[PDB]
Amino acid sequence: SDRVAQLTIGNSTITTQEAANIIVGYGEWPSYCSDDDATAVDKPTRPDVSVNRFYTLDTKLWEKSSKGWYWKFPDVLTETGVFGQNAQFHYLYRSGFCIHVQCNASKFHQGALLVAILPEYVIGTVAGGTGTEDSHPPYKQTQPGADGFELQHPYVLDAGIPISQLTVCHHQRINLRTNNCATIIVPYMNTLPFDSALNHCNFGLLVVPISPLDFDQGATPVIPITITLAPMCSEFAGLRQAVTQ
Amino acid sequence: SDRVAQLTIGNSTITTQEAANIIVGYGEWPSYCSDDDATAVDKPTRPDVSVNRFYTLDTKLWEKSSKGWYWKFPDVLTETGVFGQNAQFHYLYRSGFCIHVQCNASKFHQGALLVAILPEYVIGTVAGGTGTEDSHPPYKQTQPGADGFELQHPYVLDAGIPISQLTVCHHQRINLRTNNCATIIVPYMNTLPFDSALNHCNFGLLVVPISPLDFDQGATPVIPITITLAPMCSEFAGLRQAVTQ
Amino acid sequence: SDRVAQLTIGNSTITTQEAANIIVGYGEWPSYCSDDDATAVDKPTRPDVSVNRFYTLDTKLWEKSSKGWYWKFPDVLTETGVFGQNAQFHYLYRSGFCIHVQCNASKFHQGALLVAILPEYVIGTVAGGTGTEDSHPPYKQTQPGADGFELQHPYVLDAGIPISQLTVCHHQRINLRTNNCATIIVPYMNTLPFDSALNHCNFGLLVVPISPLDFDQGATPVIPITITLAPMCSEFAGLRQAVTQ
Amino acid sequence: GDRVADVIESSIGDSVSRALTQALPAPTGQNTQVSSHRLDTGEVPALQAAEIGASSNTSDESMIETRCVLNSHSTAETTLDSFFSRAGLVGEIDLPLEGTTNPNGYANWDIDITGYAQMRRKVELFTYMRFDAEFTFVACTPTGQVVPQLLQYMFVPPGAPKPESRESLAWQTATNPSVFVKLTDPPAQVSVPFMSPASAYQWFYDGYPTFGEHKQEKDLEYGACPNNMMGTFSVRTVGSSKSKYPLVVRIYMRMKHVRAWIPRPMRNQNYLFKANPNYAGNSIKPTGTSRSAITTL
Amino acid sequence: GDRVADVIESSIGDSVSRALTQALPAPTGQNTQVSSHRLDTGEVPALQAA
Ligand SMILES: CCCCCCCCCCCCC/C=C/[C@H](O)[C@H](N)CO
C-alpha cells in the first residue's frame, strides 16, 4: 500500500516493491505557465508524451571508497531524445521533474545514501587550497551532463556549505535494509517563468553515502546506482536553429 | 488473507502459510450427477467422509538431474482406503478432486516446478527411436499408481506435445522464493456421466521442473515433493465382486 | 497492528517491532484500593509518575548451559529510585506491575524461553539431598533483588512443583523466530489490600529456556535477556523512618 | 475545437498550481495537552521511517505523561521582516588624498552586498529574496571626525554613464537620482524599491549568462546574474578643486517587505571572494567543535 | 477542588476493577455443531501463535 509503486508517464513504466514513498517537492506539483506569470507572447509547444517520459542516464558504482556524485538539471537531457532536440531548437524552457534513483542490494548488505535536490547548486573550488587564487570551475564540472561528476569534498558539497543541513531541501534516503528506490517530484523553480536549458541549470541532484557500504567477502561487490528521471509539464518557446551550447 | 489456507474435507486438514491461491478447474466446482445427465438407473452410493478426504501417496525427491513425474487419476487411489474398495466393488465411478502438492525449501534455495492437470493424458512411446516400430507402453507406464512414473522426454511429455503449451490446462507454479504449495480443484471431466476407475483414467498430474534446483554446498540437499489429494463429490454405481483390474 | 507496541507510562517509553501481544493477568487490570476493601484509615500517597515508570534491572546472558533465573517482586525495586524510597519510608504497599522482558537474536538463531509469573513463589531446598535435613534458604535466595538467582533444579522450580504445569499462571514465550519481547500486566494479588514490600513478595518472575539456544560458529554468541518493569497504580501508607529490611 | 478523446481528457494547460499544504496561523507556540499512559499494540508513534525524507510527527504527549501548558510565546520575532529589517554594513568607500585607492576625489562602487560576511550569510540562507530596501550612508574621517564638507551620492543605474572624474558631466543628475549632504548632518537615508527585471534577486545562479563556448577565459561569468547587477554607487567631493579632508562612506542596508524562497544550508566555511562560493580546500574546518572521544564531554 | 487539567483528567483513584472476561453459565458441556468442508484461503483456524 506504501512500499509498492508504479510510476507511469508516457511510454515508460517503473516498478518498485521496496519503496518508501514519493516526495512532492515544496508541496507543489508541477504545473504549466499561467497567462499572468507569462511575459513572452509566442505560443509554446507542449509535447505531452515525447519528452515527458522516463530517461535513464548511466550507472555509478557504490564502492567502499566512494564520496558522492552530482548531476545538473536540465543539462542531463540536452543531448538525449526528443527533449534534447526541442531544448536545442528552442530558446526557452520550463519543466518539472520526477527523479527516481535505483540501488539494489541484499539483506546482508548495509549502507545509506542521501538523495537530495539542491536548487541553484553553484560549484565552488578550493581556491588554490590557500584561498589566494580566485580559481573557477571549468565547463565540464558545472555542466557535466549525464555522466555526472565526483565530489572532491562532499562535507562542504564543493560549495562551502555543510552536507548536514542538506535535508532542508528535498531528500530521501536509500537505506538498503529498508528501501532501494528514492522518488522525488520537483516543480519548476526559478525567478522567471521560462529560461534557457543550456545556459542555466535549475537544480542539482546529490547522491552521497553518509553511512559507508559494507559486506563480507563472498557477496555481490558491485552495487550500482542508477539515475532515472522524467520531465513533467514541459514547455518550449522561441524557435530557431539548433545550437548545443 | 491469500497466502494462508486451511483445506478441511473429512477427517483431514492441511495448513499452508506460503500459498499462492486455489485454482478451480475450468471455472467449475465439482458436483453430483443430475437426473438429466444420468442414464443408469441404480441408486448410487454417496459416502461423504470415508472417501472424500485427503490421501497422501508418496514422496519424490527433487534432485538437480530431475526431469519430471506424472500420476494418473483415479489409478492413484484404487488400492488405498475406502475409496479403493468402493471403486473395486463397484463398476461405475464419478468424482472431482482437490490436488495439493508440497515442496518446502529455504529462502536460499531457488527453483520452479510446473504443476499441471492434463486431461486424457495418453502416453506415447519413442517408436523404436526411428519411428518404424509401432511400440506401445506397458501397463506399468499408463497406470503406474501412487508411485508415479519418471518422464523420459518431458519436452514432449512422452506424447509428442510441447510442455510449453501446457499452461492452457490447469496449472500452478511452485516457485520456492514465493510458494511451497500448489492447490488445484478438478471437476469430473468425461464425455460420460460415470465411468470405470480401473480401466479409464480421467486426467494426469504433471510435476516438471522448468527451472532447475540449485543450492550451495551446506544447505539441505533433500528437497521432497509430496502429492496429497482429496476426492470430491464421489459417486459409485453397479455393485458386484471386488476386481482389481 | 499486533506485532508493534509502544508502552508509555511516566517519563519512559518502550518500542517493539517483533511482539506477540500483551498479557493482562487474570483478566484484571491494576486498580486502586476501594473504601470497602480498605481497613487502614491513614490517607495513602499516590505518586503518579515518579514511581509508576519503567525500571531496568540488569542483564542475564542466555548461554547454551543455562537453566533459568527468577526475580521476586517488589524486592527488585526496594533499592531503586523513588519507588524504593517511598517503600522504605512507608510500611504499607499496593501496586500492580507491567513486566517486559527483552531478548534479541537473529533469524539464524533458535530457542525458546518461558516467561511466567508465579504468585507466592515460595523457595524450597534440596533438604540435604536425602530429605532428612530440614534445611532452609538464606535471605539472598528468597529475596535476591534485581540481580535475581539462578535456578538449581528448574524442573521442579526449586519448590517441588513441575515447570510443565506453569502455563496455568500468566506466561508468554519468547520464540526467537517469532518474537523478542514478552509483556505481562499483573494486578495486585494478595489476601490483604496492602502489605509490606520488604517482608512479603507477592509473586516471582521465572525465565526458563525450555528449548536450548543454538547457533553456528560465527554468529553473535552473546544473547542477553533484559528485565524491564513498571509499577502500576502504586499506593503507600504508614509513614515512619526509612528502614531497609 | 477539440474532438478526439485524448485531447478532451487532457491535463495539458493546467496552469493552476496544485498545493498539498496550506498555511495556517501560528501566532503562539503550540500548547501541550494532557496525556496518560498507553499500553496497547499497533499504535507506536515513536517509531519512524526517516528514509521517507519527511520529519518525525512525534510529539511529547505520546512519549511521556504530560500536563497542560497554555503557551503564550509568540512567533513574531522569527519572521523575515524581524530577521532582516536590521541595518548592517554592505559597503565601505574610502576617499583619501594621497595613495592609490581613490586619489582624485570621486569613487564608484559596484553595488553588491556580498562583501561583508555578517549580512551575506544572512541572505544566503535563501536562494531567492525579493525586497525593498533602506540605505543609510554614514560619512566620516578615518579618525571618526565630522568635518564641514559637501558630498554628492549619485545612483548610476546600468547603462548610464559612470563619472570618469570629479569635474564630469554625469554629475548633473538631470535624470539619475542623487543626494547632496554635509557631513555635519544626520546620515542620508533613502528608500529603494525592488528593481530587478526578474521576480526576485538571487544570491546563487547555477549557470552562465551568455551563450557560446565556455573556455578558461570566460569562466568568470559562471555564477554572474545580470538581474542582480543593480548598477553603481558614485560619490564625490562637490567642488572644482581638491578637498582637504580624507573621507570614508559606510553603507548600511535595511530590508523591508521581504519575501524569500527555497532555504539552503548555511555557510560554515569562511568566505573568500565576492559572489563566489569558493573555499580553502586545504584548510577545511569542521562545522563545529570537537572532542577527544565520543563517550565523554 | 481540582483546577489544573492533569488532575481533572486523571485516572488516580479509579478503584473499580476493570475486568476483560465475564463468567457465563455452563451447566452442561458445549454442544457440537454441524460442519462441512472448507477450501478457501485466509481463514486458517488450525494455525496458532502459542
Ligand atoms: C543616492 C541613491 C543611492 C541608492 C542606491 C541603491 C542601490 C539599490 C540596490 C539594492 C539591491 C541590492 C541587491 C544586490 C544583490 C547582490 O549584490 C547580487 N546578487 C550580487 O552578488
Number of the ligand 1 atom closest to the C-alpha atom of D230: 9
Specify the DSSP class assigned to residue B43: P
Residues C102 and C227: their CA atoms lie apart, in Å, by 6
In one letter, which amino acid is B176? L
**Contact D252 CB / ligand 1 (< 6 Å):** no
Please confirm whether the linkage preceding C74 is cis (ω < 30° from 0).
yes
The C-alpha of C28 sits at a distance from chain E's nearest C-alpha, in angstroms, of 5
Contact B238, B38 (CB under 8 A): no
**Contact D113 CB / ligand 1 (< 6 Å):** yes
Contacts of E9 in chain C (CB under 8 A): none
Among E12, E20, E49, the residue with its CB nearest the CB of C24 is E20
Evaluate whether the domain defined by C1-245 bears CATH number 1.20.200.10.
Answer: no
Contact D41 C21 (CB under 8 A): yes
Contact B35, B196 (CB under 8 A): no
**Residue among D155, D171, D230, D276 whose CB has most ligand 1 atoms within 8 A, to mutate:** D230
Number of the ligand 1 atom closest to the C-alpha atom of D253: 10
Residues D147 and D95: their CA atoms lie apart, in Å, by 14
The C-alpha of E5 sits at a distance from chain B's nearest C-alpha, in angstroms, of 45
Locate C19 and state its grid cell. 511482539
Among E38, E42, E47, the residue with its CB nearest the CB of B1 is E42
What does residue D137 show for φ and ψ, rounded to 5 degrees? Answer: -115, 115
In what order do the strands lie in the sheet containing B13-16? B13-16, B5-8, E38-41
Contact B37, B123 (CB under 8 A): no
Contacts of D62 in chain C (CB under 8 A): 6, 8
**Contact D228 CB / ligand 1 (< 6 Å):** yes
Contact A124, D274 (CB under 8 A): no
Spelled out in words, what is the top-level CATH class assigned to the domain D1-297? mainly beta
The C-alpha of E50 sits at a distance from chain B's nearest C-alpha, in angstroms, of 16
By DSSP bridging, strand C181-186 and strand C110-119 are: unpaired
Contact D63 C8 (CB under 8 A): yes
Contact B236, B222 (CB under 8 A): no
Method of determination is: cryo-EM
Identify the residue among E18, E21, E22, E47 best suited for mutation to test binding to C, counting C beta carbons within 10 A and taking the highest: E18
The sign of the dihedral angle between the CA atoms of D195, D200, D203, D207 is negative
**Residue among D228, D251, D276, D278 whose CB has most ligand 1 atoms within 8 A, to mutate:** D228
By DSSP bridging, strand C13-16 and strand A22-24 are: unpaired
The C-alpha of E7 sits at a distance from chain C's nearest C-alpha, in angstroms, of 11
Of how many residues is chain C composed?
245
Contact D131, D84 (CB under 8 A): yes
Locate D63 and state its grid cell. 512519549
The C-alpha of E28 sits at a distance from chain D's nearest C-alpha, in angstroms, of 36
The sign of the dihedral angle between the CA atoms of D103, D106, D109, D110 is negative
What does residue D7 show for φ and ψ, rounded to 5 degrees? Answer: -95, -35
In chain B, DSSP assigns E strands to 5-8, 13-16, 22-24, 55-62, 69-73, 90-103, 110-119, 149-150, 170-175, 181-186, 203-214, 223-239
Chain position carrying cell 531528500:
A171
Chain position carrying cell 570551475:
A137
Residues with Cβ within 8 Å of B83's Cβ and at least 6 positions away in sequence, in order, are B50, B51, B55, B74, B77, B231, B234
Contact D111, D175 (CB under 8 A): no
Residue boundaries of the structural domains of chain B: 1-245
The C-alpha of E34 sits at a distance from chain C's nearest C-alpha, in angstroms, of 31
Among D15, D54, D128, the residue with its CB nearest the CB of A31 is D15
Specify the DSSP class assigned to residue D161: P
Please confirm whether the linkage preceding A74 is cis (ω < 30° from 0).
yes
In this complex, is the C-beta atom of D34 within 8 Å of any C-beta atom belonging to chain E? yes
Resolution to 1 decimal place, in Å: 2.9
Contact C19 D37 (CB under 8 A): no
**Contact D237 CB / ligand 1 (< 6 Å):** no
Identify the residue among D205, D211, D213, D222 best suited for mutation to test binding to A, counting A beta carbons within 10 A and taking the highest: D222
* 3-state SS, residue E9: coil
Q: Whose CA is nearest to atom 9 of ligand 1?
A: D230
How many whole angstroms from D111 Cα to the centroid of ligand 1?
A: 5
Among A120, A179, A204, the residue with its CB nearest the CB of D202 is A120
Please confirm whether the linkage preceding A47 is cis (ω < 30° from 0).
no
Q: What angle do CA B192, B194, B200 make, to 5 degrees?
A: 85
Locate D290 and state its grid cell. 570537537
Locate B229 and state its grid cell. 489429494
Q: Is C20 left (phi over 0), alpha (psi -120 to 50) or beta?
A: alpha
H or E stretch covering D107: strand D106-110
What does residue C139 show for φ and ψ, rounded to 5 degrees? Answer: -70, -30
Neighbors of chain D with 3 or more C-beta pairs under 8 Å: A, C, E
Q: What is the 3-state secondary structure (H, E, C) of chain C?
A: CCCCEEEECCCCEEEECCCCCEEEHHHECCCCCCCCCCCCCCCCECCHHHHCCCEEEEEEEECCCCCCEEEEECHHHCCCCCHHHHHHHEEEEEEEEEEEEEECCCCCCEEEEEEEEEECCCCCCCCCCCCCCCCCCCHHHHCCCCCCEECCCCCCCCCCCCHHHHHHCEEEEEECCCCCEEEEEECCCCCCCCECCCCCCCEEEEEEEEEEEECCECECCCEEEEEEEEEEEEEEEEECCCCCC
Residues D228 and C86: their CA atoms lie apart, in Å, by 70
Neighbors of chain C with 3 or more C-beta pairs under 8 Å: D, E
DSSP H helical ranges for E1-50: 5-8
How many other CB atoms are found less than 10 A from the CB of residue B180? 17
Contact B57, B144 (CB under 8 A): no
What does residue C150 show for φ and ψ, rounded to 5 degrees? Answer: -85, 125
The C-alpha of C215 sits at a distance from chain D's nearest C-alpha, in angstroms, of 30
How many whole angstroms from D55 Cα to the centroid of ligand 1?
A: 37
**Contact D133 CB / ligand 1 (< 6 Å):** yes
Contacts of A119 in chain D (CB under 8 A): 127, 204, 206, 262, 264
Identify the residue among D35, D36, D37 best suited for mutation to test binding to C, counting C beta carbons within 10 A and taking the highest: D37
**Contact D111 CB / ligand 1 (< 6 Å):** yes
Q: Whose CA is nearest to atom 15 of ligand 1?
A: D228
By DSSP bridging, strand C13-16 and strand C170-175 are: unpaired
Q: What angle do CA D132, D135, D140 make, to 5 degrees?
A: 175
**Contact D131 CB / ligand 1 (< 6 Å):** no
Neighbors of chain A with 3 or more C-beta pairs under 8 Å: D
Q: Whose CA is nearest to atom 13 of ligand 1?
A: D228
Contacts of A173 in chain D (CB under 8 A): 50-51, 53
Among D35, D45, D65, the residue with its CB nearest the CB of C6 is D45
* 3-state SS, residue A27: helix
Q: Whose CA is nearest to atom 20 of ligand 1?
A: D112
Q: For chain D, how big is the Rg over CA atoms in Å?
A: 27
By DSSP bridging, strand A181-186 and strand A22-24 are: parallel
